[PDB]
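A student in our group prepared the protein record below, which I am reviewing. Thanks in advance; the entry in question is below.
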Amino acid sequence: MVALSLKISIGNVVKTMQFEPSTMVYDACRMIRERIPEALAGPPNDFGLFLSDDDPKKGIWLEAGKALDYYMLRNGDTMEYRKKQRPLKIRMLDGTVKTIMVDDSKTVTDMLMTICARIGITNHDEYSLVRELMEEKKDELNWLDHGRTLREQGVEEHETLLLRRKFFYSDQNVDSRDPVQLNLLYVQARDDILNGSHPVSFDKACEFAGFQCQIQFGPHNEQKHKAGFLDLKDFLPKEYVKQKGERKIFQAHKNCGQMSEIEAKVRYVKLARSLKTYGVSFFLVKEKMKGKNKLVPRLLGITKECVMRVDEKTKEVIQEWSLTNIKRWAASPKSFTLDFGDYQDGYYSVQTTEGEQIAQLIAGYIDIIL
């Protein structure tokens, strides 16, 4: 009977109450409900005991099943008999915001389970809550620890959380569950694009740059991802740095929303592999103009199946031939020539220093069939 004298705060009321240090929090609550009428303003499950801190993130709810002495309580400490139920704004998959009363003492996981049940979602484990704006000044990331509470993470009641389904994708090429292999595919594809080995359009370069932003900086932040934030040399093929790509790139970045790094790498790779130019060995050549002294720069591509003539600026395939249409080919130290015989009127000849390299490649590919 070495009683604990605790100040009980309910609204404007302060009553000092005696408890044995072994008293259970649930019993302490009952004792308060029998003495202070203010304590009866709602059901016992809507209230709890709370130990405040100047830092709201450091305030703690007592667990019903614990004893008061677990919380290292001492004579003269104040305990607040406070309402647990708070509002939580959640952005739905359809973009609408639903406000729901949640128990501030519960974990993010427990709130997500409550959320799913109210909107009729069959598996809460396929979803997560994300932050709208992560406070950079604090250690508050866009990612939320689903084992910790909203209070301890500094999620203020006027803050919205987004409902997002967990991303999963796989095929013969890529698997979202193997981030190692996915990173190998990503880096290769990215590097080919940035160094011009894989020629793409300006519009595509800006899409690839938007994903690259998403991967390297996370979701677009308008307050941080401003004019001159990007070193465009690192995000675009050199030939597109001249152009005002930043506006285009920031819109592509913005269009990604709160897409995970994994999803952005998967989308990058799948987008790179979708282009006709993917896996094509390109040579920058020059075309002679009959009766003129100008030459027209062009991109010549080679694959096991075909030869393509691609516009150097737009990267449009303006012609293509099957490797099986080649009748003869011939190289010199200043030019390369293709003969398609019946499958075209005139040879296709271009000015190039790498004619032997081109011819070597074609020889190799022709070697397999017949």
In short: The chain has seven helices and 16 strands. The longest strand covers residues 281-288. The helical segments are 25-33, 108-118, 179-194, 202-217, 245-255, 261-274, 355-368. The longest helix spans residues 179-194.
